[PDB]
Design a protein around this nucleic acid. Sequence first.
DNA 1: GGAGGCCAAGATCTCAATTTCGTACAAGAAATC
Lengths: 342, 263, 104, 235, 104
Amino acid sequence: MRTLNFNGKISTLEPLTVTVKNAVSTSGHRLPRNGGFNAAPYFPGTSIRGTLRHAAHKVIVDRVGLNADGKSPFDLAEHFMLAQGVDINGEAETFAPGEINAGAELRSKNPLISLFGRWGLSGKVGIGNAIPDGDNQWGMFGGGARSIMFQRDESLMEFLETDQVDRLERLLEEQAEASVDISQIKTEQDALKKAMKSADKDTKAELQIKVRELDEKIQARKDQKQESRESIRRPIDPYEAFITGAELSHRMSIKNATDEEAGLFISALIRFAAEPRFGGHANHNCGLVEAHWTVTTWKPGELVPVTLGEIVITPNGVEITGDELFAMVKAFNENQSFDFTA
Amino acid sequence: MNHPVESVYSALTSILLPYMGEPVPVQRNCSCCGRAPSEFDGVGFELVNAYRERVVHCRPCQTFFVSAPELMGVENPKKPTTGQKFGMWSGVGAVINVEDNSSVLLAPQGVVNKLPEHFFDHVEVITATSGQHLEYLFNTELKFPLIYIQNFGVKTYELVRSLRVSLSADAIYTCADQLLTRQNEVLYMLDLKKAKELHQEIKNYSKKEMDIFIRTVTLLAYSRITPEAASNEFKKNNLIPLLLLLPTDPHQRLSILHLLKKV
Amino acid sequence: MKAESLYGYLKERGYSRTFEAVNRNIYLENLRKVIRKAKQSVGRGIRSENDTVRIIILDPRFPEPTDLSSKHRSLEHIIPVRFRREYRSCEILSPAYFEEDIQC
Amino acid sequence: MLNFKPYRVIMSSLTPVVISGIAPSLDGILYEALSQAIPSNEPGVVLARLKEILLFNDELGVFHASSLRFGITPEQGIGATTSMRCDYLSPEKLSTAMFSPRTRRGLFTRVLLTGGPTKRRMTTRPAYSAPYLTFDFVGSSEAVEILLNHAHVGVGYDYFSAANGEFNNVTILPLDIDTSISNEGMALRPVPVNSGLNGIKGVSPLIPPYFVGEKLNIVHPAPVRTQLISSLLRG
Amino acid sequence: MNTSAVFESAGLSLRKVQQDYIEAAAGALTQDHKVALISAETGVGKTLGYLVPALLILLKNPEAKFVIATNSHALMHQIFRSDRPLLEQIAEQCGIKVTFSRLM
DNA sequence: GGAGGCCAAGATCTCAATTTCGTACAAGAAATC
Ligand SMILES: [Zn+2]
């Protein structure tokens, strides 16, 4: 039973972005910032926690393997218990509320539910956020334009048959005229948003519904397009990411740890290193990270950190350092009495 | 007996007590409120929801899952034989007087249309959208203790276990079918007394000064303008007394601003 | 060129970090050398227990006591821990306008 | 048992802080930090060892550890942000390689994510995003500094799971007057009703952890308190 | 052991920092093949700080040696000028001597 | 004939728009491989 603090740096190999509803607004896609636009963005610890929980779930799946029938032994209930800790079939040990150290049997038998908790059983892994070290380590990456393929490469028109070349011509015509119509409607809409600022509240009971009916007219016009519902020539909005090679300070911890739980966590890190991806926009290879975690623990009784080893995940390999981390991994690999089902 | 869900049942949904049936003696806690069977007198209603789970609901909780189209009108014409359910209403609110056991139903005009004339006899209904709840609360002389269900919503379980009695105008618990954790009761706490005094002192300020104050506080609460800019704006517009009446909590500020610009 | 050449080192040794990352690492290393050198400078001040030194840091970039988010906050480590209280209560030659902002 | 000094700890808030109704007390943060530092969750022993690094008011039954108070700078202020925890049922999660979906004619019954016990839970919580978090306490600076710097403890709700209210650059400055329990008769942390200290009435245990033990009536400060960082560093 | 006294048996104005340095340095030097990192701000008597563990550790296995590399001409001058009295004086209590050298 | 699953329907609404820039030196000792 040792509290393992993985204090370390995440160096970003490809830009690291995440979409959070509150952070993202109409003005554009922005990272969680904890303050104004001038504040410092942080990559959520929730995204890293979920990614590592998924990695641990995959490690558990591989260790369990498949049945003789080639199907995972886990059903939907067990899968959602291990993946997001939600009991769907209402069949879970509803531990009494006032014992902190409750569920020791489930913790021993299920190390995944131990590290990352279920509903009603506090998890042992607190995965903190990847805080950037610098001042200009974020940027509006992505961005571009979904270009009409045949208006860029003329040779692609030699593949289109005339009964489809006229279809393309109709599509471009409809896109253009629907887009100037939507532009006019948007011009009325923004003029109305200007007029909102002189609100006397006699008009406002009408103005917002007028705006809504203009949005409905926009949707109707988009529906009116017979050949393509959405304009193809779209300028892609940029997404805010952490720059390539951004050194983000990361603090992760496992609370009091049987060798098996820590071994499962280290195996989850070793499997995450196969695809070290945090966040979305994976189309642009976003999220690829390499991170060195100094695994410190607390001396028994004394308030001092002793360094047990280092977890250096890099594209070239995972360098587990320290004999004790190897011992934890070996303990997890052994002790095959785990019963992840229910 | 003494619970928020019993009180709402007695005040508001006991009108559909004839459309319940005889409960079945049960021995396991209501899956909806979560309370123990000890206060159900040992009885309960067994039921299966759309997700095929055996669920016990108690006398007050089962009233949210009743189909009484002849009384509560037809909510979806595609399914005529299933009327409006209290646990399925979205945008429909209610103010229940616990002492008087009377309820007022703040339903929007669509729901009011869907309601039969027979319904208004048992419950007084005021045509009000979700945005018009706050003006109703402001103008009407609310009698406490009371239960203010802001949005009956679709998550009946979270509504019933989120119900909290509003003991005085200091603290009105706006229950909106969203689990009322201690971490999110600030978003469901309405300081009607403090908002009322703030509105009273808003009359002393011009419409332009009121708009500037509202926008400055909203921007500050969303951290869009620096505190130094907001302080400059308040000092230049002589808005210090209004700020002195606002709670330091930014979510309380946003709620009270919503309340001001709704009325 | 230290940043560029060190980037060459990491590139040819296989480590994948972009050149701007090596620039940042070199910057942080140099800033820690600056912290050590300035600590030496302040150590010039007091050598005997009876020594009394009035240290005048005329650099605008030395973090103010009230500016805990200042870019070069690590330079505050130049002052020894024991004399950090007078660092907090220090006369500022050219301070920056504060106010009585009601939203305290 | 060790000599304890009034210290004010100011740290940079890196993520929005979620307040569980009552303002997070520094004693709860230190209790979690110790529970991590001594690998034992028993409240009794962790409390016994917390007294050795925090002063404990015996006649009042509370730790000399003021509640959270946000330090707002003229550039950044207390803000209303939402801590959003959202289920991400990815296609890889929603795949036969990890579980066996119930089959019907060789088609896999899709998980009904819209509603039901297997929905994409979009839990939104109020969070407060201030540039600085401040506490006051009467204790050993060394131990609390080590804990706050290296123990995996944040300010607010479920810092383990949601990573809420993470902080760095923890700075401790000694105070001249004990402002942990009382300040001009205004309670600066959860204190019992009978203490004569005025504030906001509430129900909570006086000593951490604040989720076990009888919830007796207490007076606690305003959950969201704001002070200028200059006023806080004045001492 | 004489270590406990040193400054109270021979007689010197011990501070808490000095005894802390002596104990930590001796414990470090006990560790074999390790590298000991100590920051000692001006005022801790660093010379004494690392010369006291040398003389006390000499008690066990007195064939050990401690090369003291000091960068500057002036650091070297002041330290050895100050330590020629001091370390001799101190060792006079345990009975050990000082084969002080003058390498350069 | 009962039990799973897919799909359409249900009340109006609540709100806020940053505008790029780090850091600018000295010398300790020397039988160097
Ligand atoms: Zn119930």
